[PDB]
Design a protein around this ligand. Structure first.
Ligand SMILES: C=C(C)[C@]12C[C@@H](C)[C@@]34O[C@](Cc5ccccc5)(O[C@@H]1[C@@H]3C=C(COC(=O)Cc1ccc(O)c(OC)c1)C[C@]1(O)C(=O)C(C)=C[C@@H]41)O2
Ligand code: NA
Lengths: 536, 199, 70
């Protein structure tokens, strides 16, 4: 074999399969070649910063990735040296994980990868009826379905979730089962296992909590079982709970607002309670406000610990959790200053109150109409203003320091008022009162008019054009964004639920086939779906 | 400064402003941030340069009209009048018509005509054209960025200010080694690995 | 290395009238050459020059701000 760092483990059998020479494969296997050797070179491993051909490091997976059905059939079925269909690579990927990995959501790729996947499954069932390859998890704990959901392999999900086998002795491998059909309408049962109730890593968890880099994150929720499942989950119990939480949050914000407005004006907190109704209701409001802040605080910590997000995607995802957490931090800092005998708690409280209303827009997510505005503001804050800040600050600081250099003892000669005044000029709310007595007036007028033209006419409209581009770029995407928000809300409601019950099964513990390869009969929590198609 | 003039301050101040603004040159070569620099360059060189003549025609025509009409008021001088009309164009006027000079109605008609022509029509025409320029190249960044990067590389190779010229990439490798004569070729060949998922 | 006029100089210092000025750099050897040169030594030198220019501007700013008023 090769013993370098790059081609390590490659032997003649891999070369013969790669060359598509069936004769050489047959002869090498006949001569005692090892059909389960691992090719673990850097060229042959999954990697980002180097080209390579990752295929799962094994001859069987090499044939499978390359669309050579005869070779995999020979390798499994030959008596000279049979292959282990459940063999695992250094990553723990099997042939199925390798097949999912090399997909890329194109037509020919989808066709042959789907075909080879089906053939591998049939061969496994016939040769090893007690073996369940799809239950095998890789080193990341992912089944091939979980891997496909993670990577955005939309075509592979479209195959797997709607898989139906019209062949006896292997129907137990099917996940879709058709119950009846009429002219345009037909009803089928879907397996539903490890869509929502898996205990390790479900499909909906993987789709919802993906890192937003997955190209088809929006379209994966349109695959029919997931779409109907989420719609029924919404209509069943989540909708009422969501409205209840929204109402409770509104009551919380009203109480916080009323309590903050009627604060006392005496110095040196804390303030003693008098035996009067006003003090009792006021301190009641204070206690409830601090309680809510503590609640959001611990929820935020639980979220960050459960997700463990990276810095680079820290704000791209988890936006709303960050803002709720920041609100709770301001509430706690207000409490600390309140009991530290400082007036400045008022300042912290004020900021929290403002955020307390603005974060109400979180609840517009999950409506087709009103959800669009929150995401539009999210994209416009994270993308456009964050980048444009440096350019505008360059202009602001350059001209501000120029002006403060020029003026000798006027209203301008201090960077604070100059920066404020020039900012007012940026938004077109300056004054331009040139009736002063400082020298170098003409130079000042040239500078200020140059700034005004550069910022108010040129830069600001550049920003506005880009923001408009962002706005219209997602105006038509409202359907997808609504769906994804709906899914995240449903999973979050299912996770916590504050009653210890998890009666969120979609349908009964029904039997699909009932005839395993062994003498048992299977029930799999099937889900009935009726669909209409007017084709032909 | 060495000629014993205060006016050095004025020159210095202008340089300082440019000294900060030219910092945007270093946003060139970032895939995200060079787009703002090139957008500003294209807008300044094309759109304002062309539109300057149209706006100056309108400004001078109405300014000379207004200076002709008014007899000894605050407007009766081209400097203040041009300044005020420019302020009117950007939406920074007053329009306080409580003065006591004759031909008030003619002044009002002229000024409102200027305001409608400049504030509503011309400025929005300008903004539409600039928006067209902005969106024309927003997608072109992937093309633009590489080119900017390329130029920088050559300059960093061109001067390099250390007398070393280690500009080669790989070894002095033999490609063929059998010319039509008995000699052998070494050509500083550079190795590249490429991937193509076709078929 | 051409010693008269290399390809990269010709593409880069073109007059902007060339129709395919951007697409010429997409041809694979040139693209890989630029990426290699960028990652190898040019990126650090560029960042260093940017830092030095920032220090220059800060010094110029501080010097100008405290000018004498006599
Ligand atoms: C931590 C961040 C990222 C943040 C916190 C504060 C300072 C914030 O300004 C920013 C920066 C900023 C400040 C001023 C103008 C524009 C942007 O954006 C948010 C943050 C942004 C906002 C704007 O609110 C929204 O984006 C609405 C919203 C969109 C999506 C959501 O999921 C959502 O639910 C939480 C709310 C509200 C503020 O927190 C607020 O109330 C105040 C006083 C300032 C806003 O800083
Ligand atoms: Na205004």
């Amino acid at each position: 074999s090769y013993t370098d760092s790059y081609y390590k483990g490659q032997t003649a059998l891999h070369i013969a399969i790669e060359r598509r020479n069936m004769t050489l494969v047959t002869l090498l296997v006949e001569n005692g070649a090892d059909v389960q050797a691992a090719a673990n070179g850097d060229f042959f491993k999954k990697t980002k910063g180097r080209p390579g051909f990752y295929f799962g490091e094994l001859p069987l997976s090499l044939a499978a990735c390359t669309n050579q059905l005869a070779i995999v059939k020979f390798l499994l079925q030959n008596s000279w040296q049979p292959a282990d269909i459940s063999a695992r690579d250094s990553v723990g990927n099997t042939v199925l994980h390798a097949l999912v990995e090399v997909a890329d959501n194109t037509v020919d790729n989808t066709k042959f990868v789907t075909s080879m996947y089906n053939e591998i499954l049939i061969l496994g069932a016939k040769l090893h009826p007690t073996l369940k390859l799809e239950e095998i998890t890789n080193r990341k704990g992912l089944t091939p379905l979980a891997l496909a959901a993670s990577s955005g392999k939309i075509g592979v999900l479209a195959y797997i979730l709607q898989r139906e086998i019209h062949e006896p002795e292997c129907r137990h491998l099917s996940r879709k089962f058709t119950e009846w059909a009429y002219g345009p309408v037909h009803s089928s049962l879907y397996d539903l296992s490890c869509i929502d109730t898996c205990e390790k890593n479900s499909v909906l968890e993987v789709i919802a909590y993906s890192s937003s880099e997955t190209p088809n994150r929006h379209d994966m929720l349109l695959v029919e079982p997931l779409n109907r499942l989420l719609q029924d989950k919404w209509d069943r119990f989540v909708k009422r709970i969501f409205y209840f939480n929204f109402f409770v949050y509104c009551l919380y914000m009203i109480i916080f607002t009323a309590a903050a407005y009627y604060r006392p004006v005496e110095g040196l907190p804390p303030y003693k309670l008098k035996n009067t109704v006003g003090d009792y209701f006021r301190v009641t409001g204070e206690i409830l406000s601090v309680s809510g802040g503590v609640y959001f605080f611990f929820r935020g910590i639980q979220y960050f610990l459960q997700r463990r997000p990276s810095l680079k995607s820290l704000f791209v995802d988890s936006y709303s959790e960050i803002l709720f957490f920041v609100q709770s931090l301001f509430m706690l800092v207000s409490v600390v200053l309140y009991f530290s005998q400082r007036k400045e708690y008022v300042a912290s409280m004020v900021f929290s109150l403002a955020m307390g209303w603005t974060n109400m827009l979180y609840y517009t997510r999950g409506f087709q109409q009103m959800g669009i505005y929150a995401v539009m503001i999210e994209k416009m804050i994270l993308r456009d203003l964050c980048r444009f800040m440096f350019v505008y600050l360059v202009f602001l600081f350059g001209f501000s320091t120029a002006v403060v250099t020029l003026i000798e003892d006027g209203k301008y000669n201090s960077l604070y008022s100059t920066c404020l005044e020039l900012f007012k000029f940026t938004i077109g709310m300056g004054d331009l009162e040139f009736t002063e007595n400082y020298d170098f007036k003409a130079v000042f007028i040239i500078l200020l008019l140059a700034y005004v033209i550069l910022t108010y006419i040129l830069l600001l409209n550049m920003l506005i054009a880009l923001m408009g581009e962002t706005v219209n770029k997602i105006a038509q995407e409202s359907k997808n964004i609504w769906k994804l928000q709906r899914a995240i809300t449903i999973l979050d409601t299912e996770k916590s639920f504050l009653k210890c019950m998890r009666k969120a099964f979609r349908s009964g513990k029904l039997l699909q086939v009932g005839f395993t390869p062994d003498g048992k009969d299977d029930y799999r929590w099937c889900f009935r779906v009726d669909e209409v198609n007017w084709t032909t």
